[PDB]
Amino acid sequence: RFFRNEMPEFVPEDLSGEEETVTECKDSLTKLLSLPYKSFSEKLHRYALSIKDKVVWETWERSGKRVRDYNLYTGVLGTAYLLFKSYQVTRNEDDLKLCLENVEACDVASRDSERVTFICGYAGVCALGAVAAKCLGDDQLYDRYLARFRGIRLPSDLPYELLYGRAGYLWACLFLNKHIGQESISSERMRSVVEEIFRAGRQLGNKGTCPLMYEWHGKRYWGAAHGLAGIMNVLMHTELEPDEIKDVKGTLSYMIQNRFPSGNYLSSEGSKSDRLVHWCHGAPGVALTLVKAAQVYNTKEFVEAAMEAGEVVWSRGLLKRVGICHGISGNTYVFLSLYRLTRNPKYLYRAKAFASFLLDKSEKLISEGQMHGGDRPFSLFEGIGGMAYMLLDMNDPTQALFPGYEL
Ligand SMILES: [Zn+2]
């Protein structure tokens, strides 16, 4: 379920060339939407600082700096990452320091952990640690997180998907390497994870239909978090061979040709219900993946499919939940992604409308239960942590990357 999107479509025409139409309804929301970007982004920035502060209060100070959760998704690493994003935007070195203090606590709390991914496990802790240390200029701290990251091993048991599986660990490696700008994690190690991914996908899949196939919890999920999209997405970020490229292209075509009559995407193989429009399941996560296919492959099929997935988000993507995983902050990135790809200000405008909706309405909507605020209300993936993160990323919308998804 979604709020009906009755927000005004983007107007390309230069008006005013007045005169401001008198009978046109002008509330606080419409005034936000009309705002020129410079002051609109400054406004969202100030709001995001208050959210950020609130999140730091609750997850760090109130709790007396004690760490139970730890991971990016719902735990304290979500807070460190938000602090990191804030540092990236503001260059406030106190944000980076606090970041590192949160990481260190997460590290302590994550020994004994068997979680291996960026978003849900220990590779997330180590890769942020190492990147934050590099920014700070602390080489010894860097080596130390780098050694912990390099000690990670993958049970033959692991799944393939993003939250718990190999695409997830491999995502962390790509993230670490891109940011340091070095082969910090070994290219042979990353290539080996890739080959295991194609091996299993090819074994369970049929060259006739979907050339690559996976299962998590015995389910054949299509989406970003546990499905085909998230895996293909990660694979596009590495050096494929020609037949690997065909197989990734193939799996993505398969999904395009086989979506709902509404243009939304199935949660999992033969599902009979068109209901979810989330990053985790549905159009939003898949759109982000097609945008990436579009950038790498430059195919009409992918470009147009990405745009079409964007229309499903535009009409149904205004979820009654605030967050990144399955909410408005997370669906905003669909428009940001389309904007990065096309440079078409209509897509910026669409991200601007979802962000304005959240700033104008979210507090009121959450506090009277018409918007769900996340089970962990201050987490990165469920709570307002992710709204602050999205808000901060609007400051420089062409540099905005869905956290733990886009590289
Ligand atoms: Zn979700």
- Report the DSSP beta bridge partners of residue 268: 221
User: In this structure, are residues 51 and 323 in contact, taking their beta carbons and an 8 Å threshold?
Assistant: no
Domains of the chain are 1-407 (1.50.10.10)
Cα–Cα distance between 141 and 133 in angstroms, integer? 6
- Report the DSSP beta bridge partners of residue 219: 216
Locate tokens 């005004």: which residue?
Answer: 8
Q: Please choose, from the candidates 283, 149, 173, the residue with its C-alpha nearest in 3D space to the C-alpha of residue 237.
A: 173
Question: What b/e string do you get for 351-373 counting C-beta neighbours within 10 Å, with b at 16 or more?
Answer: bbbbbbbbbbbbbebbeeeebbb
Question: Which chain residues have CB less than 5 Å from ligand 1, an ion?
Answer: 280, 325-326
Ligand 1 centroid – CA 14 distance (Å): 39
Cα–Cα distance between 209 and 251 in angstroms, integer? 8
Q: What's the resolution in A?
A: 2.2
- Report the DSSP beta bridge partners of residue 221: 268
Locate tokens 């002051």: which residue?
Answer: 39
Could you give the C-alpha distances from 71 to 28, 208, 267, 399, 402, in angstroms and in order?
A: 37, 39, 25, 24, 17
Cα–Cα distance between 343 and 291 in angstroms, integer? 13
Ligand 1 centroid – CA 164 distance (Å): 14
Tell me: is residue 45 an annotated ligand-binding position: no
Residues with Cβ within 8 Å of residue 192, at least 6 apart in sequence: none
Q: Which amino acid is at 278?
A: H
User: In this structure, are residues 196 and 166 in contact, taking their beta carbons and an 8 Å threshold?
Assistant: yes
Q: Cα 95 from chain centroid?
A: 21
Strand (E) positions, 81-163? none
Ligand 1 centroid – CA 144 distance (Å): 32
Q: Cα 307 from chain centroid?
A: 18
User: In this structure, are residues 201 and 214 in contact, taking their beta carbons and an 8 Å threshold?
Assistant: yes
Ligand 1 centroid – CA 325 distance (Å): 4
Ligand 1 centroid – CA 280 distance (Å): 4
Question: 16's torsion region: left (phi>0), alpha (psi -120 to 50) or beta?
Answer: left
Token code pair at residue 182:
């070095």
Q: Is it true that the peptide bond before 58 is cis, omega within 30 degrees of 0?
A: no
Tell me: is residue 25 an annotated ligand-binding position: no
H/E run at residue 39? helix 37-56
User: In this structure, are residues 124 and 77 in contact, taking their beta carbons and an 8 Å threshold?
Assistant: yes
Q: How was this structure determined?
A: X-ray
Tell me: is residue 325 an annotated ligand-binding position: yes
What sign results for the dihedral spanned by CA atoms 368, 369, 372, 378?
positive
Ligand 1 centroid – CA 339 distance (Å): 23
Token code pair at residue 58:
């609750």
Q: Is it true that the peptide bond before 17 is cis, omega within 30 degrees of 0?
A: yes
Which DSSP letter does residue 216 get?
B
For 319, phi then psi, to 5°, come to -55, 150
For 375, phi then psi, to 5°, come to -70, -35
Token code pair at residue 87:
């540092």
User: Is 320 in a helix, a strand, or coil?
Assistant: coil
Other residues' Cβ atoms within 10 Å of the Cβ of residue 154: 15
Strand (E) positions, 135-247? none
Ligand 1 centroid – CA 384 distance (Å): 14
Locate tokens 């009755």: which residue?
Answer: 6
